[PDB]
Amino acid sequence: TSGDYWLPTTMSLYQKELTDQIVSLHYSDILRYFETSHYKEDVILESMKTMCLNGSLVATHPYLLIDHYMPKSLITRDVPAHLAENSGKFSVLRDLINLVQEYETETAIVCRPGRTMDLLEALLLGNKVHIKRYDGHSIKSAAAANDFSCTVHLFSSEGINFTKYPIKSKARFDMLICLDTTVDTSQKDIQYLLQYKERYAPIVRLVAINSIDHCRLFFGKKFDKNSREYLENVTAAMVILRDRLGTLPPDLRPIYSQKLHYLVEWLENPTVPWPLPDIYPLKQYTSMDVERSLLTEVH
Amino acid sequence: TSGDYWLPTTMSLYQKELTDQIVSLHYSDILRYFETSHYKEDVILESMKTMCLNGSLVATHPYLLIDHYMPKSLITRDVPAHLAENSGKFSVLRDLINLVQEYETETAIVCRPGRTMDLLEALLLGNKVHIKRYDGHSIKDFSCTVHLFSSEGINFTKYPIKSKARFDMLICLDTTVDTSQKDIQYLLQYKERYAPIVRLVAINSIDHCRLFFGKKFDKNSREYLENVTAAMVILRDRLGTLPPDLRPIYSQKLHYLVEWLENPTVPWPLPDIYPLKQYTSMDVERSLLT
Protein backbone atom coordinates (compact mmCIF):
# COMPACT_ATOMS: atom_id res chain seq x y z
CA THR A 1 0.00 0.00 0.00
CA SER A 2 0.86 3.70 0.18
CA GLY A 3 3.30 3.93 3.09
CA ASP A 4 0.55 5.82 4.90
CA TYR A 5 -1.60 3.50 6.97
CA TRP A 6 -4.06 3.76 9.82
CA LEU A 7 -4.05 1.74 13.02
CA PRO A 8 -7.52 1.83 14.62
CA THR A 9 -7.68 1.94 18.41
CA THR A 10 -10.54 1.41 20.83
CA MET A 11 -11.91 3.74 23.50
CA SER A 12 -12.16 3.06 27.23
CA LEU A 13 -15.60 3.31 28.81
CA TYR A 14 -14.44 6.55 30.41
CA GLN A 15 -13.25 7.96 27.09
CA LYS A 16 -16.65 7.11 25.61
CA GLU A 17 -18.82 8.71 28.29
CA LEU A 18 -16.48 11.72 28.34
CA THR A 19 -17.08 12.30 24.62
CA ASP A 20 -20.77 11.70 25.18
CA GLN A 21 -20.69 14.43 27.82
CA ILE A 22 -18.75 16.81 25.62
CA VAL A 23 -21.49 16.38 23.04
CA SER A 24 -24.33 16.92 25.53
CA LEU A 25 -22.55 20.10 26.56
CA HIS A 26 -22.64 21.64 23.10
CA TYR A 27 -26.11 20.17 22.55
CA SER A 28 -27.91 23.42 21.76
CA ASP A 29 -24.92 24.90 19.94
CA ILE A 30 -24.94 21.87 17.65
CA LEU A 31 -28.61 22.16 16.70
CA ARG A 32 -27.95 25.83 16.03
CA TYR A 33 -24.93 25.23 13.80
CA PHE A 34 -27.05 22.90 11.65
CA GLU A 35 -30.32 24.85 11.70
CA THR A 36 -29.29 28.26 10.40
CA SER A 37 -27.04 26.62 7.81
CA HIS A 38 -24.49 28.62 5.80
CA TYR A 39 -25.37 31.76 7.75
CA LYS A 40 -23.32 30.41 10.66
CA GLU A 41 -22.40 32.78 13.49
CA ASP A 42 -18.87 33.07 14.91
CA VAL A 43 -19.75 32.09 18.48
CA ILE A 44 -21.29 28.87 17.18
CA LEU A 45 -18.30 28.14 14.96
CA GLU A 46 -15.95 28.46 17.93
CA SER A 47 -18.29 26.12 19.78
CA MET A 48 -18.19 23.47 17.07
CA LYS A 49 -14.47 24.01 16.83
CA THR A 50 -13.71 23.53 20.51
CA MET A 51 -16.16 20.65 20.92
CA CYS A 52 -14.06 19.05 18.20
CA LEU A 53 -10.88 19.97 20.03
CA ASN A 54 -11.96 18.49 23.36
CA GLY A 55 -13.15 15.36 21.60
CA SER A 56 -9.75 14.98 19.98
CA LEU A 57 -7.93 15.29 23.30
CA VAL A 58 -10.06 12.65 25.02
CA ALA A 59 -9.58 10.34 22.03
CA THR A 60 -5.87 10.09 22.75
CA HIS A 61 -6.18 10.56 26.53
CA PRO A 62 -8.72 11.71 29.18
CA TYR A 63 -5.96 13.45 31.15
CA LEU A 64 -5.47 15.84 28.24
CA LEU A 65 -8.88 17.16 29.23
CA ILE A 66 -9.24 16.51 32.95
CA ASP A 67 -6.35 16.97 35.40
CA HIS A 68 -8.46 15.45 38.17
CA TYR A 69 -6.71 12.45 39.71
CA MET A 70 -3.76 12.49 37.35
CA PRO A 71 -0.86 11.02 39.36
CA LYS A 72 1.38 13.82 40.65
CA SER A 73 4.29 11.69 39.45
CA LEU A 74 4.32 9.91 36.09
CA ILE A 75 7.51 7.99 36.87
CA THR A 76 6.30 5.45 39.42
CA ARG A 77 6.20 1.82 38.26
CA ASP A 78 2.44 1.54 37.88
CA VAL A 79 1.83 4.63 35.72
CA PRO A 80 2.46 3.08 32.29
CA ALA A 81 -0.20 0.41 32.87
CA HIS A 82 -2.63 2.93 34.33
CA LEU A 83 -2.31 5.29 31.36
CA ALA A 84 -2.87 2.44 28.89
CA GLU A 85 -5.85 1.18 30.83
CA ASN A 86 -7.50 4.57 30.24
CA SER A 87 -6.89 5.19 26.56
CA GLY A 88 -7.39 2.48 23.98
CA LYS A 89 -4.98 4.46 21.84
CA PHE A 90 -2.22 4.25 24.43
CA SER A 91 -3.06 0.56 24.89
CA VAL A 92 -2.60 -0.08 21.16
CA LEU A 93 0.63 1.93 21.17
CA ARG A 94 2.03 -0.04 24.12
CA ASP A 95 1.02 -3.28 22.38
CA LEU A 96 2.75 -2.05 19.23
CA ILE A 97 5.94 -1.01 21.02
CA ASN A 98 6.04 -4.35 22.85
CA LEU A 99 6.75 -5.77 19.41
CA VAL A 100 9.00 -3.14 17.84
CA GLN A 101 11.16 -3.04 20.98
CA GLU A 102 12.45 -6.53 20.16
CA TYR A 103 14.13 -5.17 17.03
CA GLU A 104 17.17 -2.97 16.53
CA THR A 105 15.35 0.11 15.32
CA GLU A 106 14.82 3.82 15.74
CA THR A 107 11.11 4.59 15.76
CA ALA A 108 9.73 8.12 15.52
CA ILE A 109 6.54 9.39 17.11
CA VAL A 110 4.95 12.79 16.54
CA CYS A 111 2.27 14.24 18.79
CA ARG A 112 1.17 17.66 19.98
CA PRO A 113 3.60 19.28 22.42
CA GLY A 114 2.92 19.75 26.12
CA ARG A 115 1.11 17.27 28.33
CA THR A 116 0.67 14.87 25.41
CA MET A 117 4.47 14.69 25.20
CA ASP A 118 4.78 13.93 28.91
CA LEU A 119 2.05 11.29 28.93
CA LEU A 120 3.63 9.76 25.83
CA GLU A 121 6.96 9.53 27.64
CA ALA A 122 5.34 8.17 30.79
CA LEU A 123 3.59 5.49 28.76
CA LEU A 124 6.84 4.50 27.09
CA LEU A 125 8.67 4.05 30.40
CA GLY A 126 6.84 0.75 30.62
CA ASN A 127 8.75 -0.46 27.55
CA LYS A 128 12.21 -2.02 27.12
CA VAL A 129 13.15 1.00 25.06
CA HIS A 130 15.36 4.09 24.89
CA ILE A 131 13.48 7.39 24.78
CA LYS A 132 14.71 10.59 23.13
CA ARG A 133 12.85 13.90 23.21
CA TYR A 134 13.72 16.99 21.17
CA ASP A 135 12.30 19.80 23.31
CA GLY A 136 14.97 19.73 26.02
CA HIS A 137 12.31 18.56 28.46
CA SER A 138 11.65 15.20 30.07
CA ILE A 139 10.22 13.58 33.18
CA LYS A 140 13.28 11.39 33.81
CA SER A 141 16.30 13.66 33.10
CA ALA A 142 18.56 10.59 33.77
CA ALA A 143 19.53 8.28 30.87
CA ALA A 144 18.95 4.53 30.59
CA ALA A 145 21.98 2.76 32.04
CA ASN A 146 20.44 -0.12 30.12
CA ASP A 147 20.99 -1.64 26.72
CA PHE A 148 18.01 -1.49 24.37
CA SER A 149 17.85 -2.44 20.70
CA CYS A 150 14.92 -0.07 20.23
CA THR A 151 14.97 3.69 20.62
CA VAL A 152 11.84 5.83 20.38
CA HIS A 153 12.11 9.48 19.37
CA LEU A 154 9.31 11.83 20.47
CA PHE A 155 8.78 14.88 18.25
CA SER A 156 6.40 17.81 18.51
CA SER A 157 3.96 18.19 15.63
CA GLU A 158 4.15 21.95 16.14
CA GLY A 159 7.73 22.98 15.39
CA ILE A 160 10.84 21.05 16.43
CA ASN A 161 14.20 22.93 16.34
CA PHE A 162 16.79 20.47 15.06
CA THR A 163 19.66 22.93 15.53
CA LYS A 164 19.53 23.00 19.34
CA TYR A 165 18.44 19.36 19.32
CA PRO A 166 19.87 17.38 16.38
CA ILE A 167 19.18 13.76 15.42
CA LYS A 168 22.20 12.09 17.04
CA SER A 169 20.62 8.84 15.79
CA LYS A 170 23.01 7.81 12.99
CA ALA A 171 20.31 5.60 11.43
CA ARG A 172 16.98 5.75 9.57
CA PHE A 173 13.60 5.80 11.27
CA ASP A 174 12.10 2.42 10.39
CA MET A 175 8.64 3.90 11.03
CA LEU A 176 6.89 7.13 12.00
CA ILE A 177 3.84 7.12 14.27
CA CYS A 178 1.11 9.78 14.38
CA LEU A 179 -0.40 9.98 17.86
CA ASP A 180 -2.68 13.03 17.56
CA THR A 181 -4.38 14.42 14.48
CA THR A 182 -2.25 17.44 15.28
CA VAL A 183 0.38 15.83 13.04
CA ASP A 184 0.73 17.24 9.52
CA THR A 185 2.98 14.81 7.64
CA SER A 186 3.12 17.27 4.74
CA GLN A 187 5.03 19.89 6.78
CA LYS A 188 8.78 20.17 6.21
CA ASP A 189 10.05 19.09 9.63
CA ILE A 190 8.01 15.88 9.36
CA GLN A 191 9.09 15.35 5.74
CA TYR A 192 12.67 15.72 6.96
CA LEU A 193 12.07 12.95 9.49
CA LEU A 194 10.54 10.50 7.00
CA GLN A 195 13.50 10.92 4.63
CA TYR A 196 16.49 10.19 6.83
CA LYS A 197 18.15 7.70 4.48
CA GLU A 198 12.65 3.32 0.10
CA ARG A 199 12.75 7.13 0.17
CA TYR A 200 10.08 7.52 2.84
CA ALA A 201 9.54 5.97 6.28
CA PRO A 202 6.18 4.26 6.63
CA ILE A 203 3.58 6.41 8.34
CA VAL A 204 1.21 4.67 10.72
CA ARG A 205 -1.52 6.77 12.29
CA LEU A 206 -3.25 5.79 15.54
CA VAL A 207 -6.97 6.48 15.15
CA ALA A 208 -9.91 5.78 17.47
CA ILE A 209 -12.72 4.29 15.33
CA ASN A 210 -15.78 6.47 14.78
CA SER A 211 -14.08 9.09 16.91
CA ILE A 212 -13.28 12.65 15.92
CA ASP A 213 -9.91 11.15 14.98
CA HIS A 214 -11.58 9.01 12.33
CA CYS A 215 -13.66 11.94 11.10
CA ARG A 216 -10.75 14.39 10.74
CA LEU A 217 -8.64 11.82 8.92
CA PHE A 218 -11.17 10.66 6.36
CA PHE A 219 -13.05 13.86 5.49
CA GLY A 220 -9.61 15.44 5.49
CA LYS A 221 -8.80 13.74 2.20
CA LYS A 222 -12.09 14.92 0.75
CA PHE A 223 -12.68 18.56 1.76
CA ASP A 224 -9.34 19.70 3.13
CA LYS A 225 -8.37 22.84 4.97
CA ASN A 226 -10.93 24.92 6.85
CA SER A 227 -13.77 24.52 4.38
CA ARG A 228 -17.35 24.81 5.59
CA GLU A 229 -17.89 21.29 4.28
CA TYR A 230 -15.04 19.87 6.34
CA LEU A 231 -16.32 21.20 9.66
CA GLU A 232 -19.89 20.26 8.74
CA ASN A 233 -19.14 16.64 7.82
CA VAL A 234 -16.65 16.27 10.67
CA THR A 235 -18.90 17.65 13.43
CA ALA A 236 -21.99 15.82 12.20
CA ALA A 237 -20.03 12.58 12.14
CA MET A 238 -18.46 13.04 15.57
CA VAL A 239 -21.89 13.65 17.04
CA ILE A 240 -23.69 10.85 15.23
CA LEU A 241 -20.96 8.23 15.58
CA ARG A 242 -20.90 8.97 19.31
CA ASP A 243 -22.85 5.70 19.83
CA ARG A 244 -20.47 3.34 17.99
CA LEU A 245 -17.45 5.28 19.25
CA GLY A 246 -14.30 3.20 19.61
CA THR A 247 -15.45 -0.33 18.91
CA LEU A 248 -13.49 -2.38 16.41
CA PRO A 249 -15.44 -4.47 13.89
CA PRO A 250 -15.86 -8.19 14.63
CA ASP A 251 -13.32 -9.00 11.88
CA LEU A 252 -10.66 -6.76 13.38
CA ARG A 253 -11.03 -7.74 17.06
CA PRO A 254 -8.94 -10.92 17.21
CA ILE A 255 -5.91 -9.09 15.76
CA TYR A 256 -6.11 -6.66 18.68
CA SER A 257 -7.07 -9.32 21.23
CA GLN A 258 -4.00 -11.19 19.97
CA LYS A 259 -1.99 -8.17 21.10
CA LEU A 260 -1.24 -7.28 17.47
CA HIS A 261 1.14 -10.10 16.56
CA TYR A 262 -0.64 -10.02 13.20
CA LEU A 263 1.72 -7.14 12.39
CA VAL A 264 5.05 -8.91 12.83
CA GLU A 265 5.47 -9.77 9.15
CA TRP A 266 4.96 -6.15 8.12
CA LEU A 267 7.28 -5.01 10.92
CA GLU A 268 10.11 -7.07 9.49
CA ASN A 269 9.41 -6.28 5.83
CA PRO A 270 8.06 -2.69 5.75
CA THR A 271 7.67 -3.21 2.00
CA VAL A 272 4.89 -5.79 2.35
CA PRO A 273 1.35 -4.38 2.10
CA TRP A 274 -0.25 -3.06 5.29
CA PRO A 275 -2.17 -6.09 6.66
CA LEU A 276 -5.15 -4.05 7.91
CA PRO A 277 -8.06 -2.67 5.85
CA ASP A 278 -7.89 0.91 4.63
CA ILE A 279 -9.54 3.59 6.76
CA TYR A 280 -13.25 2.72 6.80
CA PRO A 281 -15.27 5.40 5.02
CA LEU A 282 -17.79 7.55 6.88
CA LYS A 283 -21.16 8.68 5.57
CA GLN A 284 -21.83 12.33 4.84
CA TYR A 285 -24.52 13.03 7.42
CA THR A 286 -27.36 15.50 6.95
CA SER A 287 -28.66 18.29 9.15
CA MET A 288 -31.43 15.70 9.44
CA ASP A 289 -29.27 12.90 10.79
CA VAL A 290 -27.77 15.12 13.48
CA GLU A 291 -31.21 16.13 14.72
CA ARG A 292 -32.36 12.52 14.84
CA SER A 293 -29.16 11.59 16.68
CA LEU A 294 -29.49 14.38 19.25
CA LEU A 295 -33.13 13.54 20.02
CA THR A 296 -32.51 10.22 21.77
CA GLU A 297 -30.79 12.62 24.19
CA VAL A 298 -33.96 14.72 24.71
CA HIS A 299 -36.64 13.56 27.16
CA THR B 1 -10.78 -12.70 64.22
CA SER B 2 -14.58 -12.44 64.19
CA GLY B 3 -15.64 -14.36 61.10
CA ASP B 4 -16.67 -10.98 59.69
CA TYR B 5 -13.89 -9.37 57.68
CA TRP B 6 -13.52 -6.65 55.10
CA LEU B 7 -11.68 -6.90 51.79
CA PRO B 8 -10.82 -3.40 50.56
CA THR B 9 -10.99 -2.77 46.81
CA THR B 10 -9.73 0.06 44.65
CA MET B 11 -11.62 2.36 42.29
CA SER B 12 -11.05 2.82 38.56
CA LEU B 13 -10.31 6.33 37.33
CA TYR B 14 -13.80 6.37 35.85
CA GLN B 15 -15.39 5.26 39.11
CA LYS B 16 -13.51 8.05 40.85
CA GLU B 17 -14.48 10.89 38.52
CA LEU B 18 -18.06 9.55 38.47
CA THR B 19 -18.33 9.85 42.24
CA ASP B 20 -16.65 13.27 42.01
CA GLN B 21 -19.37 14.28 39.55
CA ILE B 22 -22.14 12.88 41.72
CA VAL B 23 -20.84 15.08 44.53
CA SER B 24 -20.58 18.22 42.38
CA LEU B 25 -24.19 17.56 41.37
CA HIS B 26 -25.50 17.69 44.95
CA TYR B 27 -23.06 20.51 45.71
CA SER B 28 -25.61 23.07 46.88
CA ASP B 29 -27.85 20.47 48.50
CA ILE B 30 -24.86 19.33 50.57
CA LEU B 31 -24.01 22.79 51.90
CA ARG B 32 -27.69 23.17 52.73
CA TYR B 33 -27.93 19.86 54.61
CA PHE B 34 -25.02 20.96 56.80
CA GLU B 35 -25.91 24.64 57.21
CA THR B 36 -29.44 24.51 58.62
CA SER B 37 -28.44 21.60 60.86
CA HIS B 38 -31.04 19.53 62.73
CA TYR B 39 -33.86 21.52 61.10
CA LYS B 40 -33.28 19.49 57.92
CA GLU B 41 -35.90 19.63 55.16
CA ASP B 42 -37.27 16.52 53.42
CA VAL B 43 -36.19 17.47 49.90
CA ILE B 44 -32.61 17.85 51.12
CA LEU B 45 -32.72 14.54 53.00
CA GLU B 46 -33.84 12.74 49.84
CA SER B 47 -30.97 14.50 48.09
CA MET B 48 -28.36 13.32 50.59
CA LYS B 49 -29.98 9.93 50.50
CA THR B 50 -29.88 9.47 46.73
CA MET B 51 -26.41 11.01 46.39
CA CYS B 52 -25.42 8.24 48.78
CA LEU B 53 -27.30 5.67 46.71
CA ASN B 54 -25.69 6.67 43.41
CA GLY B 55 -22.26 6.68 45.03
CA SER B 56 -22.90 3.16 46.31
CA LEU B 57 -23.81 1.88 42.85
CA VAL B 58 -20.73 3.36 41.20
CA ALA B 59 -18.55 1.90 43.94
CA THR B 60 -19.46 -1.62 42.85
CA HIS B 61 -19.94 -0.76 39.17
CA PRO B 62 -20.39 2.29 36.87
CA TYR B 63 -22.90 0.36 34.75
CA LEU B 64 -25.27 0.26 37.73
CA LEU B 65 -25.55 4.01 37.19
CA ILE B 66 -24.93 4.58 33.48
CA ASP B 67 -26.31 2.24 30.79
CA HIS B 68 -24.35 4.12 28.13
CA TYR B 69 -22.04 1.76 26.26
CA MET B 70 -22.86 -1.30 28.32
CA PRO B 71 -22.39 -4.23 25.92
CA LYS B 72 -25.75 -5.41 24.61
CA SER B 73 -24.54 -8.94 25.36
CA LEU B 74 -22.72 -9.87 28.58
CA ILE B 75 -21.87 -13.38 27.38
CA THR B 76 -19.17 -12.66 24.80
CA ARG B 77 -15.65 -13.76 25.74
CA ASP B 78 -14.25 -10.29 26.45
CA VAL B 79 -16.95 -9.05 28.86
CA PRO B 80 -15.54 -10.50 32.10
CA ALA B 81 -12.22 -8.68 31.62
CA HIS B 82 -13.96 -5.47 30.57
CA LEU B 83 -16.20 -5.44 33.64
CA ALA B 84 -13.24 -6.02 35.96
CA GLU B 85 -11.25 -3.31 34.24
CA ASN B 86 -13.97 -0.83 35.21
CA SER B 87 -14.60 -1.62 38.86
CA GLY B 88 -11.80 -2.24 41.30
CA LYS B 89 -14.32 -4.21 43.31
CA PHE B 90 -15.00 -6.61 40.44
CA SER B 91 -11.25 -6.81 39.84
CA VAL B 92 -10.64 -7.87 43.43
CA LEU B 93 -13.51 -10.35 43.25
CA ARG B 94 -12.15 -11.92 40.06
CA ASP B 95 -8.72 -12.10 41.68
CA LEU B 96 -10.29 -13.75 44.71
CA ILE B 97 -12.29 -16.26 42.68
CA ASN B 98 -9.17 -17.09 40.66
CA LEU B 99 -7.91 -18.60 43.90
CA VAL B 100 -11.04 -20.16 45.40
CA GLN B 101 -11.88 -21.82 42.07
CA GLU B 102 -8.90 -24.15 42.54
CA TYR B 103 -10.61 -25.71 45.57
CA GLU B 104 -13.57 -28.02 45.91
CA THR B 105 -15.94 -25.54 47.49
CA GLU B 106 -19.34 -23.91 47.39
CA THR B 107 -18.99 -20.14 47.78
CA ALA B 108 -21.94 -17.85 48.37
CA ILE B 109 -22.25 -14.26 47.18
CA VAL B 110 -25.02 -11.85 48.13
CA CYS B 111 -25.69 -8.63 46.26
CA ARG B 112 -28.66 -6.44 45.41
CA PRO B 113 -31.01 -8.00 42.85
CA GLY B 114 -31.38 -6.81 39.27
CA ARG B 115 -28.57 -5.56 37.09
CA THR B 116 -26.07 -6.18 39.90
CA MET B 117 -26.98 -9.87 39.70
CA ASP B 118 -26.48 -9.94 35.94
CA LEU B 119 -23.14 -8.12 36.02
CA LEU B 120 -22.06 -10.41 38.84
CA GLU B 121 -22.87 -13.42 36.70
CA ALA B 122 -21.20 -11.95 33.63
CA LEU B 123 -18.05 -11.27 35.65
CA LEU B 124 -18.01 -14.84 36.94
CA LEU B 125 -18.24 -16.34 33.44
CA GLY B 126 -14.55 -15.51 33.19
CA ASN B 127 -13.85 -18.03 35.96
CA LYS B 128 -13.36 -21.82 35.96
CA VAL B 129 -16.48 -22.06 38.09
CA HIS B 130 -20.07 -23.30 38.25
CA ILE B 131 -22.66 -20.56 38.76
CA LYS B 132 -26.03 -21.00 40.47
CA ARG B 133 -28.65 -18.26 40.79
CA TYR B 134 -31.78 -18.43 42.94
CA ASP B 135 -34.09 -16.02 41.14
CA GLY B 136 -34.91 -18.28 38.20
CA HIS B 137 -33.12 -15.81 35.96
CA SER B 138 -29.76 -15.97 34.18
CA ILE B 139 -27.88 -14.74 31.14
CA LYS B 140 -26.71 -18.20 30.05
CA ASP B 141 -16.33 -30.09 35.50
CA PHE B 142 -15.51 -27.49 38.15
CA SER B 143 -14.43 -28.03 41.74
CA CYS B 144 -15.80 -24.62 42.64
CA THR B 145 -19.43 -23.53 42.51
CA VAL B 146 -20.52 -19.96 43.20
CA HIS B 147 -24.05 -19.26 44.42
CA LEU B 148 -25.52 -15.81 43.74
CA PHE B 149 -28.20 -14.68 46.19
CA SER B 150 -30.29 -11.53 46.37
CA SER B 151 -29.84 -9.42 49.49
CA GLU B 152 -33.50 -8.46 49.19
CA GLY B 153 -35.53 -11.65 49.67
CA ILE B 154 -34.65 -15.04 48.22
CA ASN B 155 -37.43 -17.70 48.09
CA PHE B 156 -35.80 -21.02 48.95
CA THR B 157 -39.01 -22.99 48.37
CA LYS B 158 -39.17 -22.40 44.60
CA TYR B 159 -35.36 -22.43 44.47
CA PRO B 160 -33.80 -24.69 47.14
CA ILE B 161 -30.11 -25.20 47.93
CA LYS B 162 -29.47 -28.37 45.91
CA SER B 163 -25.84 -27.96 47.08
CA LYS B 164 -25.48 -30.83 49.56
CA ALA B 165 -22.51 -29.10 51.24
CA ARG B 166 -21.61 -26.10 53.42
CA PHE B 167 -20.71 -22.69 52.04
CA ASP B 168 -17.01 -22.32 52.83
CA MET B 169 -17.42 -18.54 52.65
CA LEU B 170 -20.03 -15.83 52.09
CA ILE B 171 -19.22 -12.68 50.12
CA CYS B 172 -20.96 -9.30 50.47
CA LEU B 173 -20.82 -7.43 47.16
CA ASP B 174 -23.03 -4.41 47.90
CA THR B 175 -23.75 -2.73 51.21
CA THR B 176 -27.29 -3.79 50.40
CA VAL B 177 -26.47 -7.01 52.25
CA ASP B 178 -27.78 -7.34 55.80
CA THR B 179 -26.06 -10.39 57.30
CA SER B 180 -28.36 -10.13 60.32
CA GLN B 181 -31.48 -10.94 58.28
CA LYS B 182 -32.84 -14.49 58.51
CA ASP B 183 -32.31 -15.62 54.92
CA ILE B 184 -28.63 -14.66 55.17
CA GLN B 185 -28.31 -16.24 58.62
CA TYR B 186 -29.76 -19.39 57.08
CA LEU B 187 -27.02 -19.36 54.44
CA LEU B 188 -24.15 -18.89 56.90
CA GLN B 189 -25.34 -21.84 59.01
CA TYR B 190 -25.60 -24.65 56.47
CA LYS B 191 -23.64 -27.21 58.48
CA GLU B 192 -17.69 -23.76 63.08
CA ARG B 193 -21.35 -22.73 63.25
CA TYR B 194 -21.04 -19.78 60.88
CA ALA B 195 -19.52 -19.35 57.43
CA PRO B 196 -16.89 -16.60 57.30
CA ILE B 197 -18.22 -13.30 56.00
CA VAL B 198 -15.96 -11.28 53.76
CA ARG B 199 -17.21 -7.91 52.59
CA LEU B 200 -15.88 -6.19 49.47
CA VAL B 201 -15.41 -2.50 50.26
CA ALA B 202 -13.97 0.37 48.21
CA ILE B 203 -11.63 2.35 50.52
CA ASN B 204 -12.77 5.83 51.51
CA SER B 205 -15.86 5.21 49.40
CA ILE B 206 -19.46 5.39 50.54
CA ASP B 207 -19.00 1.64 51.04
CA HIS B 208 -16.37 2.29 53.69
CA CYS B 209 -18.51 5.00 55.33
CA ARG B 210 -21.68 2.91 55.55
CA LEU B 211 -19.83 -0.06 56.98
CA PHE B 212 -17.87 1.74 59.69
CA PHE B 213 -20.32 4.35 60.96
CA GLY B 214 -22.87 1.55 60.74
CA LYS B 215 -21.37 -0.10 63.81
CA LYS B 216 -21.46 3.22 65.62
CA PHE B 217 -24.80 4.94 64.93
CA ASP B 218 -26.93 2.25 63.33
CA LYS B 219 -30.27 2.45 61.59
CA ASN B 220 -31.55 5.70 60.10
CA SER B 221 -30.25 8.00 62.82
CA ARG B 222 -29.50 11.63 62.00
CA GLU B 223 -25.94 11.00 63.11
CA TYR B 224 -25.49 8.10 60.70
CA LEU B 225 -26.48 10.07 57.61
CA GLU B 226 -24.50 13.09 58.80
CA ASN B 227 -21.23 11.21 59.40
CA VAL B 228 -21.71 9.05 56.32
CA THR B 229 -22.47 11.89 53.90
CA ALA B 230 -19.77 14.17 55.30
CA ALA B 231 -17.24 11.36 54.96
CA MET B 232 -18.27 10.37 51.43
CA VAL B 233 -17.90 13.97 50.31
CA ILE B 234 -14.63 14.70 52.09
CA LEU B 235 -12.93 11.37 51.35
CA ARG B 236 -13.79 11.95 47.67
CA ASP B 237 -10.11 12.89 47.13
CA ARG B 238 -8.50 9.74 48.57
CA LEU B 239 -11.29 7.59 47.15
CA GLY B 240 -10.29 4.02 46.33
CA THR B 241 -6.55 4.02 46.94
CA LEU B 242 -5.08 1.28 49.10
CA PRO B 243 -2.42 2.26 51.65
CA PRO B 244 1.24 1.63 50.73
CA ASP B 245 1.31 -1.32 53.14
CA LEU B 246 -1.64 -3.02 51.51
CA ARG B 247 -0.72 -2.54 47.86
CA PRO B 248 1.70 -5.44 47.31
CA ILE B 249 -0.90 -7.93 48.56
CA TYR B 250 -3.24 -6.71 45.82
CA SER B 251 -0.51 -6.30 43.21
CA GLN B 252 0.40 -9.88 44.05
CA LYS B 253 -3.11 -10.79 42.91
CA LEU B 254 -4.05 -11.66 46.51
CA HIS B 255 -2.03 -14.84 46.98
CA TYR B 256 -1.47 -13.52 50.51
CA LEU B 257 -4.89 -15.02 51.29
CA VAL B 258 -4.22 -18.65 50.39
CA GLU B 259 -3.38 -19.69 53.93
CA TRP B 260 -6.66 -18.29 55.25
CA LEU B 261 -8.52 -19.84 52.32
CA GLU B 262 -7.34 -23.29 53.33
CA ASN B 263 -7.77 -22.82 57.08
CA PRO B 264 -10.79 -20.49 57.53
CA THR B 265 -10.05 -20.71 61.26
CA VAL B 266 -6.78 -18.77 61.01
CA PRO B 267 -7.08 -15.02 61.72
CA TRP B 268 -7.96 -12.76 58.78
CA PRO B 269 -4.55 -11.66 57.40
CA LEU B 270 -5.67 -8.10 56.58
CA PRO B 271 -6.05 -5.17 59.02
CA ASP B 272 -9.47 -4.41 60.45
CA ILE B 273 -11.60 -1.84 58.66
CA TYR B 274 -9.68 1.44 58.94
CA PRO B 275 -11.58 3.93 61.08
CA LEU B 276 -12.93 7.16 59.61
CA LYS B 277 -12.97 10.55 61.31
CA GLN B 278 -16.22 12.18 62.37
CA TYR B 279 -16.18 15.23 60.11
CA THR B 280 -17.72 18.58 60.99
CA SER B 281 -20.05 20.89 59.13
CA MET B 282 -16.76 22.78 58.94
CA ASP B 283 -14.77 20.08 57.18
CA VAL B 284 -17.43 19.59 54.50
CA GLU B 285 -17.43 23.29 53.69
CA ARG B 286 -13.64 23.36 53.45
CA SER B 287 -13.76 20.24 51.26
CA LEU B 288 -16.41 21.64 48.89
CA LEU B 289 -14.58 24.95 48.45
CA THR B 290 -11.64 23.62 46.43
From Swiss-Prot, chain B:
GO terms for cellular component: cytosol; HDA1 complex; nucleus. It comes from the Eukaryota. The keyword Nucleus applies. One of its GO terms (molecular function) is chromatin binding. It is found in: Nucleus. GO terms for biological process: chromosome segregation; negative regulation of transcription by RNA polymerase II; positive regulation of transcription by RNA polymerase II; regulatory ncRNA-mediated gene silencing. Keywords: Chromatin regulator, Coiled coil, Nucleus, Repressor, Transcription, Transcription regulation. The keyword Repressor applies. Belongs to the HDA2/3 family. HDA3 subfamily. Required for activity of HDA1 histone deacetylase complex. The HDA1 histone deacetylase complex is responsible for the deacetylation of lysine residues on the N-terminal part of the core histones (H2A, H2B, H3 and H4). Histone deacetylation gives a tag for epigenetic repression and plays an important role in transcriptional regulation, cell cycle progression and developmental events. Heterodimer with HDA2. Component of the HDA1 histone deacetylase complex composed of at least one HDA1 homodimer and one HDA2/HDA3 heterodimer. Interacts with HDA1 and HDA3. Present with 1100 molecules/cell in log phase SD medium. This is HDA1 complex subunit 3. It comes from Saccharomyces cerevisiae (strain ATCC 204508 / S288c) (Baker's yeast).
